[PDB]
Structures are given as structure tokens and as C-alpha cells.
């Protein structure tokens, strides 16, 4: 379970924009600066920035 350290405001329909306090399920993340998480509310997918989230 990861947490949004900053309110990610995506601009395209590929990544989901999340605010601070919202949690996201990290999928793949071990190098690229952009990871892909999956929300647990509706169940959507979106590449979340690796600088707007942190393990917690």
C-alpha cells in the first residue's frame, strides 16, 4: 500500500490524478520514474509519478 505524498494532477486520460491522503496499490516499480498503481475505490489503473507517492 503506498500513499500520495503530493496531489498528482495528471493531464492525459492515461494516468489517474490523485490528491494527498489518497492511497494507491503500486503495481510495477523498480526503476522507471513513473510507476503504475491501481485505485481501490472504483478499481481503475493509472501511471502514478514516483515522486508524488511513498511506501507507507
Amino acid at each position: 500500500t503506498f500513499v500520495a505524498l503530493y496531489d498528482y494532477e495528471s493531464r492525459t486520460e492515461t494516468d489517474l490524478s490523485f490528491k494527498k491522503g489518497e492511497r494507491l496499490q503500486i503495481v510495477n516499480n523498480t526503476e522507471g520514474d513513473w510507476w503504475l498503481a491501481h485505485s481501490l475505490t472504483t478499481g481503475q489503473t493509472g501511471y502514478i509519478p514516483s515522486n508524488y507517492v511513498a511506501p507507507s
Binding site: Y6, Y8, D33, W34, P49, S50, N51, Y52
Partner: peptide, 9 residues
């Protein structure tokens, strides 16, 4: 206040 500038993909 301003989050870090999104890195380049």
C-alpha cells in the same frame, strides 16, 4: 506548496 516538477517520461 508546489510539488516537484514531474520528471520526463
Amino acid at each position: 506548496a508546489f510539488a516537484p516538477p514531474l520528471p520526463r517520461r
